[PDB]
Design a protein around this ligand. Structure first.
Ligand SMILES: CN1Cc2ccccc2C1=O
Length: 107
């Protein structure tokens, strides 16, 4: 209940503090990304996730992991594989899986 909240908040904070998190900190701007919102149907970012967390949306580990996973998969679908964004996604995704395992969210 509140142990879930505290674990998620800690995980989410560590992810947001990571050096490769900078591309994901806020919603993608239509302005900077031609045809993003036609192709990416469930956009996600770490600011929206902070809100969802604060709003007590993450009642299960699955809902949290789906959202954060979506951040990475959206990025990898949209961007070229050797783009800096794609590289950041995979670095931070590694970090993400490391932290969820460390906390026994993958039980
Ligand atoms: C994760 N991001 C951030 C961003 C900014 C501009 C264009 C694409 C992206 C993207 O996939």
């Amino acid at each position: 209940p509140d142990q879930l909240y505290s674990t998620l908040k800690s995980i989410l904070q560590q992810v947001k503090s990571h050096q490769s998190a900078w591309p994901f900190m806020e919603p993608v701007k239509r302005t900077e990304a031609p045809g993003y919102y036609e192709v990416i149907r469930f956009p996600m970012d770490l600011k929206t996730m902070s809100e969802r967390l604060k709003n007590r949306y993450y009642v299960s580990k699955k809902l949290f992991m789906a959202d954060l996973q979506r951040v990475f998969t959206n990025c990898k679908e949209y961007n070229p594989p050797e783009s800096e964004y794609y590289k950041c996604a995979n670095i931070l995704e590694k970090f993400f899986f490391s932290k969820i395992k460390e906390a026994g969210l993958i039980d």
